[PDB]
Amino acid sequence: IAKAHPNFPIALQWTGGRGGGHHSFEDAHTPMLQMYSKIRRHPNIMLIFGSGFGSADDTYPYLTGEWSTKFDYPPMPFDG
Amino acid sequence: MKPEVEQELAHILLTELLAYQFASPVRWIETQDVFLKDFNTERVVEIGPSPTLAGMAQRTLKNKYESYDAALSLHREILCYSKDAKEIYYTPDP
Amino acid sequence: GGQGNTDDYFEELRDLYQTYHVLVGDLIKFSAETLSELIRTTLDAEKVFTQGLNILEWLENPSNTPDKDYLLSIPISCPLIGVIQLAHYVVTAKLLGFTPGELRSYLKGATGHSQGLVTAVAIAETDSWESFFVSVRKAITVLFFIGVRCYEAYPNTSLPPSILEDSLENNEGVPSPMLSISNLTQEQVQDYVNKTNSHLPAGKQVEISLVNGAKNLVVSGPPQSLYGLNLTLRKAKAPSGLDQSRIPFSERKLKFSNRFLPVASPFHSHLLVPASDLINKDLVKNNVSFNAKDIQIPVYDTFDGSDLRVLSGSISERIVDCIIRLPVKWETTTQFKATHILDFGPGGASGLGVLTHRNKDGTGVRVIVAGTLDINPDDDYGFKQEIFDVTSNGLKKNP
Amino acid sequence: LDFDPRDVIKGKDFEITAKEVYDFTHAVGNNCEDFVSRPDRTMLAPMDFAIVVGWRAIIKAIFPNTVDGDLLKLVHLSNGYKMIPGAKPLQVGDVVSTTAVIESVVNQPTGKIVDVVGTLSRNGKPVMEVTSSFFYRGNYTDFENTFQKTVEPVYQMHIKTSKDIAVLRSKEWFQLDDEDFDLLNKTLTFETETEVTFKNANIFSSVKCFGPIKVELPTKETVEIGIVDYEAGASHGNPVVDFLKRNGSTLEQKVNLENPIPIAVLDSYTPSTNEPYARVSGDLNPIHVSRHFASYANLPGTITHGMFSSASVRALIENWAADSVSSRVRGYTCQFVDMVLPNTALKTSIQHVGMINGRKLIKFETRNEDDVVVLTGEAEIEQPVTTFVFTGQGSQEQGMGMDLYKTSKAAQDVWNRADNHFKDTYGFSILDIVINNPVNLTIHFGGEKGKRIRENYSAMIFETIVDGKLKTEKIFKEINEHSTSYTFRSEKGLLSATQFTQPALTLMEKAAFEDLKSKGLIPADATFAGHSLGEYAALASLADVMSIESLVEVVFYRGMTMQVAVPRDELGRSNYGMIAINPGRVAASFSQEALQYVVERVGKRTGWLVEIVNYNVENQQYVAAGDLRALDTVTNVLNFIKLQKIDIIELQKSLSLEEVEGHLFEIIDEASKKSAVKPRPLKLERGFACIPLVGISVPFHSTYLMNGVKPFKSFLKKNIIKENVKVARLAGKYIPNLTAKPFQVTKEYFQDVYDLTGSEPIKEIIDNWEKYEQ
């Protein structure tokens, strides 16, 4: 989609299975643990991450990028 | 050794081996192992009316000799005479 | 890049004698001449090159080239991969008008894979253009004695075809002395080879050779036993298009591809250990011996990860041990902070640079392929031209 | 050149060095990855290395002066090997001794052929034989030193009439040890080896013919009787084969497969030059290296070595036919047709056409670039390591083998020799049993044949152990010297009563196995075993322990002895049976000792009889037998405990060992009378992990039958003859079921069988073991 439309902001609300309501089977991290690079190669993607967030401390490591450190990965910060 | 006294002794031994085989139980465990573990048979051929021993060998193969026959990577081939005649007669069809 | 990145490495010399003929013609002539001289002066390697190793005539008419059954073997390839790595090095030092020492003065450090590390430590001693050929000799003889002193330590024997045909429909190639496993951690492959080493004796045990990526590994061993662990992996198979998308994550079975690397000998295993002293004596038999005061740029260990300036005894000793006995921990040897990785190893678009890129992806490092001139659509890495661009189009920084 | 073309040629001892075959393998282009090892250890050699170690002795036979030849136009015609059966392939530490004897020097019009048969040995033992065929082309009329010698195809002579045994001893070259030998219905084979000395192209000067005459025993094991002894000057043929041509058949061990199955079509490359091979093989023949010689012999040029071309094609086969294991090639032979020039590509065909002695007969044929044949030969290539397991009782059905009995001449020759024997000794034929299982079988006792058969029925005795007393009591209580009939009873049919199934099953297996022997499908080193009934059908099939007539005897007697020791009802059904237990379904943690904890308490508590009789596959298949009143209790207790998943195994872990004693005593004496509500006609049903066994109503392989084992042993001593048992086909290849270790004649093996059976014949042997010494 983004490759079809360069200058049109499209936000990826990547949630994970561990959320409420309707439900996916995937784990939260591993898909974004290996798609993040394929995304940031498009500046018109707002990367948003949900599924299980309750406080600042809960999601702060995802904000800075430190979450991928404990998964042996470059720090990958999210956009919201 | 002296072959003929050995014939004598072995005839005695076989005699009693078949004799008390009558009532003693069948240790098909240790046999099923030794001919499948020590000699590493590639073709077990069940000669019989129905494939009971072939089914008895596949389930001990998949169960206790799965890592083994992989680490060695054999084509451990199970055949009964009933159902596997072309593979034992070496007459497969094109 | 070391051995085993491409299938037909000799095709990368096609262009080199073809393209930069006026440029690398002298160097390839010198290399081939001293190399054939090595075959003559050595005791019994006249027998290990069954079809001879006169390479010059293999260049003009490809009909003079023996095929991969004789061309992919180690005692014939290991020098040729090194000369390819040296030729892609001379063409850029030349096209940038640099004496070897000049270009070397630019880098922060140089390291090699399985094989190329000798080429790196060789470059680290190069100062002028005339003082270059002594280093070329120093290098190429090391790889000539590694290939020979291994190919009799663990030669190739014909694999029983009962495996050659049973491996193709299993979507694999001819079993080669090394196998690559993806999407699998270093702990799990050890968990498995421990199950396979439990059965077989020491002379057929396998081990991990290259910790290539974090989820990309390579194990070595006899093609028989390697195909064996390939089998014992099939109990843990899952086809890649099975659509586990309707079963929870922890309930899924790990799918991952694997393939045999087009190699001819089990590098970084125990199977070659009996050759270490046999090459160490072969080197001191000749003049080849590298010293710390002779190199200026840091050169990193594939096993430790440290610089080869600091070493107890002869540096040339650990260099071979890193190619025969010790495994390579590639992320442990990439503990350097640099902005660009330009690779002169073999393989180009499939060589070492691409996997290094996939490892150091979100670290902001920018690999460029110093081997081939082509284009990449997304341009995650670079090519020949990006080495030579004078505009701002060359200095491209991946994020 | 005062060399004698008749004597044997003594070679010279050649200790293989480990670098000699490393150098050979490559110089041959033998890419077979099966022969190269590391130094400081011995190496293993190729079969063709025999020529390396045999050449200096093999060719000394074409040198003697009386065999005059033009060595230049000498042509190598064919080369064959024979790795003699029973020897291991050659290793490099082996100091191999070679010996070659010229066999025959035949003189055709187009030259003369010499065939040298060398025999190489180590440690005195012969290792392998090498045959070869040269050719001194030209004309020769030196018949006065010409002689041929051959081995004839073994001829069978199936004597049926009484007038042939006359024409036999009507002959002068047919003599035995005792001419009084009963020659009727016997089977005479003639393994003869004939010599001949020529005086013209056709008029012989001296013919010899000799070779033992053997007879099929009732075990079909051939034993010699006499010796063919023929000799005649100025013959014109050989009579002793003619009288065997039309009178008898040819016992051809080569059996062709039904349809040829191709293996591969490959390509090889003649070397650049013939120098590398010539240096290895020690064959410095200047026809392949020099050019001032091949041109001297009108040859296309510096041709290759033919022997190299043989070794390469053999290496072309071990990889593809033997899956790259060399020990499977036990013989190889090849013809040279025309010659090939170096640096050439060869289209080699590989095809499976025949069988021999249970090993594969692979023909091959190498085409040139213009696709002209140069090499034709075949290979004595082993099969994989094979095991034949023979089934047991419970698997019987209609027509079993009665299809094969319609097809395999070598099979119906078993059911015939069996029923005919039963027809005449018990008035009762199996071939009418299996093709339509009757419900009841009355035996009539007619006139003379009848009385003879009835006393034969009353002539069997069921002994029983009572305080050492070998108590002689009657098998057949209803029989007597006044009975005129006797009936057999079973509701479903007598293929459900072990009285008749045992002989039917052992027949069908033995009758199907010896058909395979007719097809050459049985290795010499094949292993064999049987599940609880197939032991006899295996022994007789593999080691030929007993004649088929005496085999069916004991197997029928076994059925009877098993039958009488259990009380059957009015119609002949029993209160006993057997059951199949799968510890996997009851509990994923159900151990082997879990069954011993669950069922031994049934036996000790209910006072009934149930025992795990067979250990088939652990945690997956254990079958028990015995009293059905307790067998259904062991059935129901598992179908209940699977519903509860109460692992006695963790009770040994969670609780103590003696608290669980009473803890499981509660469960067992609680479920025992709960299940004991059964009526009299106990019909068994499949539950969660119990699988009933149909037909089987006797609980064999139980201590319950321990009383009736000395009678059997005493009976066994009569039927099996020590002369018939051959230890060669038993050591290591027979795995008994009493002892689950391969049959080996050792003290500990005796001690192994003894301490588990407590029998005196082993204690009296181990205490008098010094019969080991003579």
Residue ranges making up the domain that contains D243: 139-253
Looking at residue C1, the DSSP 8-state letter turns out to be: -
SS percent in chain A: helix, strand, coil, step 5: 35, 10, 55
Which helix (H) or strand (E) is C368 found in, with range?
A: strand C366-369
CATH code for the domain in which residue C350 is found: 3.40.366.10
The CA angle D363-D368-D369, to the nearest 5 degrees, is 140
If you write DSSP's letter for every residue of D575-592 in order, what string do you get? SEEEEEE-HHHH-TT--H
If you write DSSP's letter for every residue of D345-388 in order, what string do you get? EEEEEEEEEEEETTEEEEEEEEE-TT--EEEEEEEEEPPPPEEE
Nearest CA among D338, D343, D327, D344 for reference residue D365: D338
Last residue of a domain, one of C231, C264, C297: C264
Distance CA C336, CA C197 (A): 35
Distance CA C133, CA C100 (A): 11
Pairing of the two strands D386-390 and D527-530: parallel
CATH code for the domain in which residue D311 is found: 3.10.129.10
SS in 3 state form for D247-300? CCEECCCCEEEEEEEEEEEEEEECCCCCHHHHHHCCCCCCCCCCCCCCCCCCCC
Pairing of the two strands A45-49 and A10-14: parallel
- Residue D36, token pair as written in the block: 């190269």
Chain B neighbors of C162, CB-CB under 8 A = 75
CB-based contact A26 C249, cutoff 8 Å: yes
> Is some CB atom of chain B closer than 8 A to the CB atom of D258?
yes
Active-site hit among C31, C114, C180, C220:
C114
The partner residues of D204 in beta bridges, in order of sequence, read: D198
Tell me the one-letter amino acid at D502.
Q
Which one of C47, C50, C158 has the shortest CB-CB distance to D33? C158
Give phi and psi for C156, each to the nearest 5.
-90, 135
Pairing of the two strands D610-617 and D174-176: unpaired
Overall size of chain C counted in residues? 399
- Residue C96, token pair as written in the block: 């940038």
Give phi and psi for D209, each to the nearest 5.
-145, 130
Q: State yes or no: is C114 an active-site residue.
A: yes
Distance CA B56, CA C162 (A): 26
C-beta of residue D691 within 8 angstroms of C-beta of residue D580:
yes
Distance CA D533, CA D505 (A): 8
Largest Cα span, chain A: 37
Does D593 share its domain with D685? yes
Chain C neighbors of B67, CB-CB under 8 A = 195-196, 198-199, 232
C-beta of residue D734 within 8 angstroms of C-beta of residue D742:
yes
Distance CA D68, CA D45 (A): 35
Conformation bin of residue C226: beta by default, left when phi > 0, alpha when psi is -120 to 50: alpha
Nearest CA among C262, C341, C281 for reference residue C74: C262
Residue listed under structure tokens 């050719």: D135
Which one of C153, C155, C158 has the shortest CB-CB distance to D324? C158
Does D281 share its domain with D323? yes
* Contacts of residue C265, Cβ cutoff 8 Å, sequence gap at least 6: C74, C150, C151, C154, C156, C177, C272
Does C292 share its domain with C345? yes
Nearest CA among D560, D503, D590 for reference residue D698: D560
Q: What 3-state DSSP class applies to D402?
A: coil
Q: Do B and A have ≥3 inter-chain CB pairs under 8 A?
A: no
Deposited resolution, Å? 2.8
**Which of C249, C253, C396 best tests the A interface by mutation, with the highest count of A CBs <10 A?**
C249
Does C7 share its domain with C106? yes
Q: Which chains reach chain B with 3 or more Cβ–Cβ distances below 8 angstroms? A: C, D
* Class in CATH terms, B3-89: alpha beta
CB-based contact C362 A30, cutoff 8 Å: no
* Contacts of residue D223, Cβ cutoff 8 Å, sequence gap at least 6: D214, D215, D217
Which helix (H) or strand (E) is D691 found in, with range?
A: strand D690-692
Chain C neighbors of B71, CB-CB under 8 A = 195-196, 198-200, 225, 228-229, 232
Q: What 3-state DSSP class applies to D480?
A: coil
The CA angle C214-C216-C217, to the nearest 5 degrees, is 105
Conformation bin of residue D483: beta by default, left when phi > 0, alpha when psi is -120 to 50: beta
Q: What 3-state DSSP class applies to D63?
A: coil
In this structure, the number of other CB atoms found within 10 A of the CB of residue D542 comes to 21
Decide: residue D112, CB within 10 A, 0-12 exposed, 13-18 middle, 19+ buried: buried
- Residue D741, token pair as written in the block: 């270790």
If you write DSSP's letter for every residue of C311-336 in order, what string do you get? -SS-HHHHHHHHHHTSPEETTTS---
Q: Which chains reach chain D with 3 or more Cβ–Cβ distances below 8 angstroms? A: B, C
- Give Cα D540 to chain centroid, integer Å: 11
Nearest CA among C338, D459, D740, C373 for reference residue C386: C373
* Contacts of residue D758, Cβ cutoff 8 Å, sequence gap at least 6: none
Distance CA D406, CA D418 (A): 15
C-beta of residue D81 within 8 angstroms of C-beta of residue D331:
yes
Tell me the one-letter amino acid at D763.
K
Residue listed under structure tokens 């055709």: D108
Q: What 3-state DSSP class applies to C33?
A: helix
Distance CA D220, CA D228 (A): 21
Nearest CA among D145, D141, D115, D114 for reference residue D200: D141
C-beta of residue C7 within 8 angstroms of C-beta of residue C116:
no
Does C228 share its domain with C269? no
* Helix locations, D459-591, DSSP H: 498-518, 534-542, 548-564, 583-586
**Chain B from 1 to 60: CB within 8 A of any C CB:** none
CB-based contact A74 C362, cutoff 8 Å: yes
Buried (b) or exposed (e) across C278-290, using 16+ Cβ within 10 A? Answer: ebbebbeeeebeb
Does C165 share its domain with C309? no
* Contacts of residue C163, Cβ cutoff 8 Å, sequence gap at least 6: B73, C175, C224, C227
Q: What 3-state DSSP class applies to A19?
A: coil
Does D129 share its domain with D232? no
Q: How many angstroms away from the CA of C229 is the closest CA of chain B?
A: 6
Strand order in the sheet with D690-692: D610-617, D621-627, D576-581, D690-692
Distance CA D232, CA D209 (A): 9
**Which of D28, D263, D324 best tests the C interface by mutation, with the highest count of C CBs <10 A?**
D324
- Residue D487, token pair as written in the block: 């009936």
Query: What Å distances lie between residue D717 and B8, B68, D476, D541, CA to CA?
Result: 12, 42, 22, 19
Q: How was this structure determined?
A: cryo-EM
Chain B neighbors of D508, CB-CB under 8 A = 48-49
C-beta of residue D81 within 8 angstroms of C-beta of residue D131:
yes
Last residue of a domain, one of C264, C292, C307: C264
CB-based contact C155 D36, cutoff 8 Å: yes
Does D317 share its domain with D362? yes
Last residue of a domain, one of C264, C283, C305: C264
Largest Cα span, chain B: 53
In this structure, the number of other CB atoms found within 10 A of the CB of residue D526 comes to 19
Give phi and psi for D106, each to the nearest 5.
-90, 145
Residue ranges making up the domain that contains C140: 1-156+265-397
Buried (b) or exposed (e) across C205-221, using 16+ Cβ within 10 A? Answer: bbbbbbbbbebbbbbbb
If you write DSSP's letter for every residue of B26-74 in order, what string do you get? B-HHHHHHHHHHTS--SEEEEESSSSHHHHHHHHHHHHHSHHHHHHTT-
- Residue A80, token pair as written in the block: 């919201």
Q: What 3-state DSSP class applies to D324?
A: coil
* Contacts of residue D298, Cβ cutoff 8 Å, sequence gap at least 6: none
Which one of C162, C163, C196 has the shortest CB-CB distance to B71? C196
Looking at residue D89, the DSSP 8-state letter turns out to be: P
Between chain C and chain D, how many beta carbons pairs sit less than 8 Å apart? 30
CB-based contact D319 C161, cutoff 8 Å: yes
Give phi and psi for D207, each to the nearest 5.
-115, 135
Q: Which chains reach chain C with 3 or more Cβ–Cβ distances below 8 angstroms? A: A, B, D
- Closest chain D CA to residue C44: D23
Number of domains in chain C: 2
> Rounded to 10 degrees, what is the CA torsion of C73, C78, C84, C90?
-170
Does D607 share its domain with D728? no
Buried (b) or exposed (e) across D53-73, using 16+ Cβ within 10 A? Answer: bbbbbbbbbbebeebebeeee
Distance CA D331, CA D84 (A): 8
CATH code for the domain in which residue D228 is found: 2.40.128.700
C-beta of residue D512 within 8 angstroms of C-beta of residue D401:
yes
- Residue D160, token pair as written in the block: 């049926």
CB-based contact A36 C362, cutoff 8 Å: yes
CATH code for the domain in which residue D759 is found: 6.10.140.1400
Last residue of a domain, one of D665, D680, D695: D695
CATH code for the domain in which residue C219 is found: 3.30.70.3320
Does C167 share its domain with C108? no
Q: What 3-state DSSP class applies to C249?
A: helix
> Is some CB atom of chain C closer than 8 A to the CB atom of B72?
yes
Query: What Å distances lie between residue D722 and B12, C240, C301, D227, D768, CA to CA?
Result: 8, 64, 74, 26, 19
- Residue C74, token pair as written in the block: 């180690």
Does D183 share its domain with D123? no
Catalogue the active-site residues of D. 532
Does C221 share its domain with C318? no
Give phi and psi for C192, each to the nearest 5.
-80, -45
The CA angle D242-D248-D252, to the nearest 5 degrees, is 100
Does D241 share its domain with D290? no
**Chain D from 379 to 408: CB within 8 A of any B CB:** 383-392, 394-397, 400-401
Distance CA C112, CA D326 (A): 42
Looking at residue D36, the DSSP 8-state letter turns out to be: -
* Contacts of residue C329, Cβ cutoff 8 Å, sequence gap at least 6: C211, C302, C303, C305
Residue listed under structure tokens 């024979």: D82
Does C4 share its domain with C102? yes
Distance CA D303, CA C334 (A): 59
C-beta of residue C75 within 8 angstroms of C-beta of residue C147:
yes
In this structure, the number of other CB atoms found within 10 A of the CB of residue D453 comes to 20
CATH code for the domain in which residue D620 is found: 3.30.70.3330
SS percent in chain D: helix, strand, coil, step 5: 35, 25, 40
Number of domains in chain D: 6
The CA angle B32-B38-B42, to the nearest 5 degrees, is 75
- Residue D558, token pair as written in the block: 């076994």
Chain C neighbors of B75, CB-CB under 8 A = 162
CB-based contact D319 C158, cutoff 8 Å: yes
Which one of B20, B35, B60 has the shortest CB-CB distance to D527? B35
